[PDB]
């Protein structure tokens, strides 16, 4: 579940896989998962 | 840049291309010397002096 609208854009050309050390979770998927596209949600139904 | 009697260019790629990707940047050669040394010659009797 990624984000939807990007705030602002970035500006560094660097790769990124060496510096995993700064970030705390890093996932890097090889080319277009199938993963980020099924959205689930929680619901709740009238309240009395 | 001028050099000689000459106008040419004068380029670096490793920005534009080659940057925060895998191939490594093709202009840096290698060099190749084979090295060699005696192990245990022994001079003549009248080359033995200080």
């Known amino acids: 579940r990624p984000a939807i609208l990007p705030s602002g854009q970035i500006l560094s050309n660097i790769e990124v896989h060496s510096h995993r050390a700064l970030f705390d979770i890093f996932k890097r998927f090889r080319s277009d998962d199938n993963n980020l596209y099924g959205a689930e949600f929680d619901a709740l139904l009238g309240t009395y | ?50």
């Open chain 2, 1 to 50: 840049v001028v050099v000689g009697d000459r106008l040419v260019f004068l380029e670096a790629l490793e920005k534009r291309v080659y940057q925060a990707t895998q191939v490594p940047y093709p202009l840096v050669g290698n060099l190749d010397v084979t090295f060699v040394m005696p192990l245990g010659v022994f001079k003549p009797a009248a080359d033995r002096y200080a």
